[PDB]
Scaffold this motif. Structure first.
Motif, PDB file in Angstrom:
ATOM      1  N   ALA A 443      18.570 -31.979   0.030  1.00 58.64           N
ATOM      2  CA  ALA A 443      18.719 -32.489   1.469  1.00 58.64           C
ATOM      3  C   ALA A 443      18.636 -33.921   1.469  1.00 58.64           C
ATOM      4  CB  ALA A 443      17.467 -31.586   2.028  1.00 58.64           C
ATOM      5  N   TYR A 444      18.028 -34.419   0.498  1.00 55.86           N
ATOM      6  CA  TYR A 444      17.996 -35.873   0.641  1.00 55.86           C
ATOM      7  C   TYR A 444      19.615 -36.434   0.722  1.00 55.86           C
ATOM      8  CZ  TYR A 444      16.481 -40.634   0.168  1.00 55.86           C
ATOM      9  OH  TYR A 444      16.061 -42.102   0.652  1.00 55.86           O
ATOM     10  N   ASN A 445      20.286 -35.905  -0.292  1.00 54.72           N
ATOM     11  CA  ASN A 445      21.652 -36.024  -0.555  1.00 54.72           C
ATOM     12  C   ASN A 445      22.539 -35.677   0.232  1.00 54.72           C
ATOM     13  OD1 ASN A 445      24.352 -35.501  -2.771  1.00 54.72           O
ATOM     14  ND2 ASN A 445      23.633 -37.512  -2.700  1.00 54.72           N
ATOM     15  N   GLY A 446      22.456 -34.391   0.524  1.00 57.49           N
ATOM     16  CA  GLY A 446      23.445 -33.643   1.490  1.00 57.49           C
ATOM     17  C   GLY A 446      23.309 -33.308   2.681  1.00 57.49           C
ATOM     18  N   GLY A 447      22.069 -33.574   3.056  1.00 56.70           N
ATOM     19  CA  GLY A 447      21.613 -33.233   4.497  1.00 56.70           C
ATOM     20  C   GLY A 447      20.782 -31.975   4.447  1.00 56.70           C
ATOM     21  N   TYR A 483      23.317 -34.186  -8.300  1.00 55.10           N
ATOM     22  CA  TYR A 483      22.203 -34.825  -7.876  1.00 55.10           C
ATOM     23  C   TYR A 483      20.778 -34.338  -8.157  1.00 55.10           C
ATOM     24  CZ  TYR A 483      19.310 -37.880  -4.648  1.00 55.10           C
ATOM     25  OH  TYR A 483      18.454 -38.572  -3.875  1.00 55.10           O
ATOM     26  N   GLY A 484      20.657 -32.999  -7.675  1.00 59.13           N
ATOM     27  CA  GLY A 484      19.553 -32.340  -7.787  1.00 59.13           C
ATOM     28  C   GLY A 484      18.774 -32.072  -8.907  1.00 59.13           C
ATOM     29  N   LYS A 485      20.016 -31.770 -10.104  1.00 60.42           N
ATOM     30  CA  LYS A 485      19.344 -31.769 -11.531  1.00 60.42           C
ATOM     31  C   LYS A 485      18.929 -33.210 -12.059  1.00 60.42           C
ATOM     32  CE  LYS A 485      23.224 -28.344 -12.657  1.00 60.42           C
ATOM     33  NZ  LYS A 485      24.273 -28.219 -13.631  1.00 60.42           N
ATOM     34  N   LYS A 486      19.613 -34.084 -11.815  1.00 63.22           N
ATOM     35  CA  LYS A 486      19.075 -35.462 -12.244  1.00 63.22           C
ATOM     36  C   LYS A 486      17.770 -35.833 -11.394  1.00 63.22           C
ATOM     37  CE  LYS A 486      23.375 -37.462 -13.786  1.00 63.22           C
ATOM     38  NZ  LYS A 486      24.549 -38.147 -13.504  1.00 63.22           N
ATOM     39  N   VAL A 487      17.588 -35.585 -10.299  1.00 64.02           N
ATOM     40  CA  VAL A 487      16.478 -36.051  -9.467  1.00 64.02           C
ATOM     41  C   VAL A 487      15.212 -35.169 -10.093  1.00 64.02           C
ATOM     42  CG1 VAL A 487      15.071 -36.160  -7.403  1.00 64.02           C
ATOM     43  CG2 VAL A 487      17.356 -37.225  -7.505  1.00 64.02           C
ATOM     44  N   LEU A 488      15.416 -33.714 -10.367  1.00 62.65           N
ATOM     45  CA  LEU A 488      14.520 -33.135 -10.938  1.00 62.65           C
ATOM     46  C   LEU A 488      13.996 -33.499 -12.326  1.00 62.65           C
ATOM     47  CD1 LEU A 488      12.803 -30.599 -10.506  1.00 62.65           C
ATOM     48  CD2 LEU A 488      14.283 -29.164 -11.430  1.00 62.65           C
ATOM     49  N   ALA A 489      14.836 -33.927 -13.111  1.00 62.18           N
ATOM     50  CA  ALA A 489      14.560 -34.497 -14.559  1.00 62.18           C
ATOM     51  C   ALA A 489      13.541 -35.675 -14.363  1.00 62.18           C
ATOM     52  CB  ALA A 489      15.562 -34.678 -15.295  1.00 62.18           C
ATOM     53  N   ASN A 490      14.083 -36.585 -13.259  1.00 58.21           N
ATOM     54  CA  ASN A 490      13.308 -37.993 -13.047  1.00 58.21           C
ATOM     55  C   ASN A 490      11.698 -37.628 -12.619  1.00 58.21           C
ATOM     56  OD1 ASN A 490      15.652 -39.369 -13.697  1.00 58.21           O
ATOM     57  ND2 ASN A 490      16.084 -39.726 -11.452  1.00 58.21           N
ATOM     58  N   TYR A 491      11.712 -36.350 -11.829  1.00 54.19           N
ATOM     59  CA  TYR A 491      10.620 -36.072 -11.065  1.00 54.19           C
ATOM     60  C   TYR A 491       9.700 -35.573 -12.333  1.00 54.19           C
ATOM     61  CZ  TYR A 491       7.555 -32.942  -8.228  1.00 54.19           C
ATOM     62  OH  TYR A 491       6.519 -32.230  -7.835  1.00 54.19           O
ATOM     63  N   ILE A 492       9.992 -34.789 -13.052  1.00 52.80           N
ATOM     64  CA  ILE A 492       9.249 -34.300 -14.182  1.00 52.80           C
ATOM     65  C   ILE A 492       8.739 -35.257 -15.111  1.00 52.80           C
ATOM     66  CG2 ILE A 492       9.330 -32.989 -16.165  1.00 52.80           C
ATOM     67  CD1 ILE A 492       8.989 -31.278 -13.535  1.00 52.80           C
ATOM     68  N   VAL A 493       9.498 -36.414 -15.346  1.00 52.25           N
ATOM     69  CA  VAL A 493       8.993 -37.660 -16.149  1.00 52.25           C
ATOM     70  C   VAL A 493       8.032 -38.654 -15.246  1.00 52.25           C
ATOM     71  CG1 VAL A 493      10.050 -39.652 -17.253  1.00 52.25           C
ATOM     72  CG2 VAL A 493      11.295 -37.661 -17.582  1.00 52.25           C
ATOM     73  N   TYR A 494       8.350 -38.683 -14.055  1.00 54.23           N
ATOM     74  CA  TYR A 494       7.515 -39.609 -13.398  1.00 54.23           C
ATOM     75  C   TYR A 494       6.255 -38.784 -13.283  1.00 54.23           C
ATOM     76  CZ  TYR A 494      10.706 -43.251 -12.346  1.00 54.23           C
ATOM     77  OH  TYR A 494      11.491 -44.362 -12.697  1.00 54.23           O
ATOM     78  N   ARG A 495       5.969 -37.490 -12.914  1.00 51.80           N
ATOM     79  CA  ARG A 495       4.808 -36.844 -12.727  1.00 51.80           C
ATOM     80  C   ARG A 495       3.685 -37.044 -14.204  1.00 51.80           C
ATOM     81  NH1 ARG A 495       3.842 -31.863  -9.083  1.00 51.80           N
ATOM     82  NH2 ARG A 495       1.872 -31.955 -10.294  1.00 51.80           N
ATOM     83  N   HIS A 496       4.845 -36.787 -15.237  1.00 52.37           N
ATOM     84  CA  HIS A 496       4.053 -37.075 -16.964  1.00 52.37           C
ATOM     85  C   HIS A 496       3.672 -38.386 -16.932  1.00 52.37           C
ATOM     86  CE1 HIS A 496       3.902 -37.201 -20.994  1.00 52.37           C
ATOM     87  NE2 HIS A 496       3.578 -35.835 -20.897  1.00 52.37           N
ATOM     88  N   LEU A 497       4.355 -39.550 -16.320  1.00 50.02           N
ATOM     89  CA  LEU A 497       3.927 -40.717 -16.492  1.00 50.02           C
ATOM     90  C   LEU A 497       2.924 -41.469 -15.512  1.00 50.02           C
ATOM     91  CD1 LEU A 497       7.399 -42.585 -16.892  1.00 50.02           C
ATOM     92  CD2 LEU A 497       5.823 -42.560 -18.493  1.00 50.02           C
ATOM     93  N   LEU A 498       2.339 -40.410 -14.536  1.00 51.58           N
ATOM     94  CA  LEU A 498       1.423 -40.704 -13.572  1.00 51.58           C
ATOM     95  C   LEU A 498       0.439 -40.000 -13.885  1.00 51.58           C
ATOM     96  CD1 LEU A 498       3.625 -41.339 -10.431  1.00 51.58           C
ATOM     97  CD2 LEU A 498       2.392 -42.857 -11.514  1.00 51.58           C
ATOM     98  N   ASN A 499       0.218 -39.422 -14.991  1.00 54.69           N
ATOM     99  CA  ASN A 499      -0.951 -38.326 -15.536  1.00 54.69           C
ATOM    100  C   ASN A 499      -1.014 -37.349 -14.278  1.00 54.69           C
ATOM    101  OD1 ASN A 499      -1.864 -39.485 -17.935  1.00 54.69           O
ATOM    102  ND2 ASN A 499      -2.516 -41.259 -16.610  1.00 54.69           N
TER     103      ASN A 499
END
Ligand SMILES: CC(=O)N[C@H]1[C@H](OCCc2ccc3occc3c2)O[C@H](CO)[C@@H](O)[C@@H]1O
Length: 512
Positions: A443-447, A483-499
């Motif tokens: 929705a962020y990318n496509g509406g 976009y969704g696949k890339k953002v989901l990967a990033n989300y998992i990483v940042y959740r990990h990095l933020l403990n």
């Protein structure tokens, strides 16, 4: 910036954006507009339509063939042979001819241009596609498809195995599979030998085979895709399907050891108790340099230099931008310099988000990483702006109507405090309606309209043998699908990095 000052800047998307802002405010005179197309970096879309309301383009007919365009369907039998064959490049032109003239012209061209003959006689029938399919005229097939997507027919094994050799095949297959159009064509493409396709085409034909529950054929296509894809991320997506279909543990092991960090490799790591991938840590000791991170023209200049830097010049730029203030430019240089092998997941301007909850922080960071790589003055081909890549219309709606920021201008989107604040604001809206971070990304990318319509369908993100993975392959807009696949990967990483780790399997369960 006046038009005179802009004209002194190098051609770029930033210069284009500022020219477009003058056009939309009616500040470009017919006289100013005279030389302006040489000042436009990418003369496509809205800037072209605005400029053309001021100065139409007549252009362009090759002067050699100008006389050919003085004839019409009524007079083309008076034209010389070269003129006749030039005008028959257009299927609409052929469709406009009377059938007696199509018969005459088909005879004229039978020897030198049997391609033209085939199309002329095809248009004398009530189904030109059937005639072209019976002739197995491959160039004719694609011309007819480009002319009209409504033709649909069964295609035999011999014909369908000839289609992949044509440049039009990849877009044809993608379009009909994703849009769920042309079902006779779709069904026919089950008989394509995997030996005859590769890369994206093979992958799409695997997806096609899944929708008809032809799982052995699907495996064969996906295996061919994995063997031929140039990018490790795409190979991983294909290997994941190989695994889901046949459950060979060597495929899952190969996926879990990938050098590419994507949702498939992350999932495979989780399923096999493999440690989370190593994330680089960038902590420059130098605090600043001279570079202005708020100058959009300065970014366009350094970006061009970075993208044309040889192996050696990247090392020089790396050192100059190894500061805290230019951390986004540093990580951008490193990502290129290390040939995309190392994982860089920076968190710049963190003071602006540190009071949000960690899950929200991660979603903001995940979106920013994919949208801009954290470049504050990022500008897209559609003139989306700053780290969160807001379209001007939404930026002004939030900044002027909702938040009522005094003296708001859309260029405030280049300020990180503003980008993260607006990003949080819109992500609140989206997440309240959609919940899943994957759906929020779509929705962020496509509406939200597109996302809602997709989720209303009986065949998308419902329960099923290969869900929710299959649905993710069938998201009908390619930019949003990726976009969704890339953002989901990033989300998992940042959740990990933020403990604040989450299992990606929990995300997938919540999609159904
Ligand atoms: C700056 C830009 O073009 N960003 C793109 C982004 O481009 C890829 C990332 C990116 C980041 C910074 C850049 O600076 C110069 C080109 C570029 C591309 O793609 C997204 C879709 O996946 C778009 O929504 C977004 O607007």
């Amino acid at each position: 910036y006046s038009i005179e000052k802009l004209k002194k800047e190098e051609n770029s998307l930033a210069k284009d954006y500022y020219i477009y802002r003058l056009l939309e405010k009616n500040k470009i005179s017919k006289k100013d507009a005279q030389d302006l197309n040489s000042h436009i970096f990418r003369y496509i879309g809205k800037i072209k339509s605005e400029l053309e309301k001021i100065i139409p383009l007549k252009p362009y007919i090759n002067p050699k063939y100008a006389k050919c365009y003085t004839y019409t369907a009524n007079t083309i039998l008076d034209a010389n042979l070269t003129c006749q064959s030039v005008r028959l490049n257009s299927l609409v032109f052929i469709a406009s001819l009377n059938s007696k003239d199509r018969t005459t012209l088909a005879q004229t061209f039978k020897n030198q241009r049997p391609d033209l003959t085939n199309l002329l006689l095809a248009f004398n029938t009530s189904d030109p596609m059937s005639y072209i399919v019976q002739k197995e005229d491959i160039n004719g097939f694609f011309k007819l498809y480009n002319y009209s997507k409504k033709y649909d027919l069964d295609l035999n094994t011999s014909l369908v195995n000839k289609l992949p050799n044509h440049i039009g095949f990849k877009d044809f297959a993608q379009n009909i599979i994703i849009k769920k159009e042309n079902p006779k064509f779709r069904h026919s493409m089950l008989e394509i030998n995997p030996e005859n396709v590769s890369e994206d085409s093979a992958f799409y034909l695997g997806v096609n085979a899944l929708t008809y529950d032809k799982t052995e054929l699907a495996y064969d296509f996906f295996k061919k895709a994995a063997q031929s894809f140039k990018s490790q991320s795409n190979k991983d997506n294909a290997i994941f399907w190989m695994w889901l279909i046949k459950n060979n543990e060597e495929d899952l092991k190969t996926l879990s050891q990938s050098s590419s960090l994507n949702i498939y490799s992350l999932y495979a790591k989780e399923l096999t108790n493999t440690p989370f991938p190593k994330i680089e840590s960038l902590n420059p000791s130098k605090k600043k340099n001279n570079f202005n991170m708020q100058d959009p023209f300065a970014w366009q200049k350094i970006n061009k230099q970075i993208r044309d830097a040889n192996a050696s010049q990247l090392d020089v730029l790396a050192k100059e931008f190894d500061t805290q203030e230019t951390l986004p430019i540093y990580a951008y240089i490193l990502e290129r310099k290390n040939n995309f092998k190392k994982h860089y997941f920076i968190m710049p301007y963190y003071d602006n988000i540190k009071d949000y909850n960690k899950t929200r922080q991660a979603l903001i960071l995940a979106i920013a990483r994919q949208e801009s790589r954290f470049i504050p003055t990022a500008i897209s081909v559609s003139y989306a702006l700053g780290m969160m890549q807001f379209m001007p219309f939404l930026a002004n709606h939030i900044g002027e109507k909702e938040l009522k920021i005094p003296n708001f201008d859309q260029d405030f989107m280049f300020k990180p405090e503003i980008a993260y604040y607006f990003g949080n604001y819109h992500l609140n809206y989206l997440e309240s309606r959609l919940k899943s971070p994957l759906f929020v990304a779509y929705a962020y990318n496509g509406g939200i309209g597109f996302t809602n319509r997709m989720l209303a369908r009986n065949d998308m993100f419902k329960t099923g043998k290969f869900e929710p993975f299959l649905s993710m392959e069938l998201v009908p807009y390619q930019e949003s699908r990726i976009y969704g696949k890339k953002v989901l990967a990033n989300y998992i990483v940042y959740r990990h990095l933020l403990n604040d780790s989450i299992k990606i399997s929990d995300i997938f369960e919540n999609l159904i």
